[PDB]
From Swiss-Prot:
Task of the protein: Catalyzes the hydrolysis of complex carboxylic polyesters found in the cell wall of plants. Degrades cutin, a macromolecule that forms the structure of the plant cuticle. Allows pathogenic fungi to penetrate through the cuticular barrier into the host plant during the initial stage of fungal infection.
Superkingdom assignment: Eukaryota
Catalytic residues as annotated in Swiss-Prot or TrEMBL: S104 (nucleophile), D159, H172 (proton donor/acceptor)
Practical applications according to UniProt: May have promising applications in chemical and textile industries as it is capable of hydrolyzing a variety of substrates including soluble esters and insoluble triglycerides. Can hydrolyze and thus modulate the surface properties of synthetic fibers such as the plastic poly(ethylene terephthalate) (PET), or the textile fibers polyamide 6,6, polyester and acrylic.
Encoding gene per record: CUT1
Site (Transition state stabilizer): S26, Q105
Protein name: Cutinase 1
Length: 197
């Protein structure tokens, strides 16, 4: 449900084939928040419980609302925490395919992290989904240094954070349907594109 630490808790001798690392929105609970559990259940349906590890970004990422106003749309400490998780994935399970996602401040965090990542690890993230992307206008719907065909952005009409503002309006809280259907669909398709099935 809202906390999943499958990568941290997982045995290196029995690595999953797919590792999903997800950052929640501001003020959300656990390390998956309101959208991550829906994505997790559909990934588990696709690859099996032993086939995918679900890992939320916890630790130093406090998901504090005020940090949306910092230069990268989150804190330096939160970026360091997500970078450390990707580096743990890469060390613990070098053959696993990675996928990533984030909502709101967590979408900014995922984009900042992927931009800073060593390219050999970045290139293992087969697909990333971003919901209510707070840097959508500033980055022109892209994650710096990462291909557009591996990116999917869900930005609702009237969600002001997608249009350069930091105002939270009702469309910002309406990504439930996307997290249940098209976002797992996209991630599964991108994993099968490189892994076959």
């Amino acid at each position: 449900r809202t906390t999943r630490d499958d990568l941290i808790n997982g045995n290196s001798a029995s690595c999953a084939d797919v590792i999903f690392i997800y950052a929640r929105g501001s003020t959300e609970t656990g390390n998956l928040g309101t959208l991550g559990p829906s994505i997790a259940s559909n990934l588990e349906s696709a690859f099996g419980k032993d086939g995918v590890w679900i890992q939320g970004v916890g630790g130093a990422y406090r998901a504090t609302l005020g940090d949306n106003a910092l230069p990268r749309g989150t804190s330096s400490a939160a970026i360091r925490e997500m970078l450390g998780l990707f580096q743990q994935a890469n060390t613990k399970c070098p053959d696993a395919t990675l996928i990533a996602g984030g909502y709101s401040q967590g979408a900014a965090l995922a984009a900042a992290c992927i931009e800073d990542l060593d390219s050999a690890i970045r290139d293992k993230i087969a697909g990333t989904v971003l919901f209510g992307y707070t840097k959508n206008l500033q980055n022109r719907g892209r994650i710096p240094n990462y291909p557009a065909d591996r990116t999917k952005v869900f930005c609702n009409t009237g969600d002001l954070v997608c249009t350069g503002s930091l105002i939270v309006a009702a469309p910002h809280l309406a990504y439930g349907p996307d997290a249940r259907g098209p976002a797992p669909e996209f991630l599964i398709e991108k994993v099968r594109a490189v892994r076959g099935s």
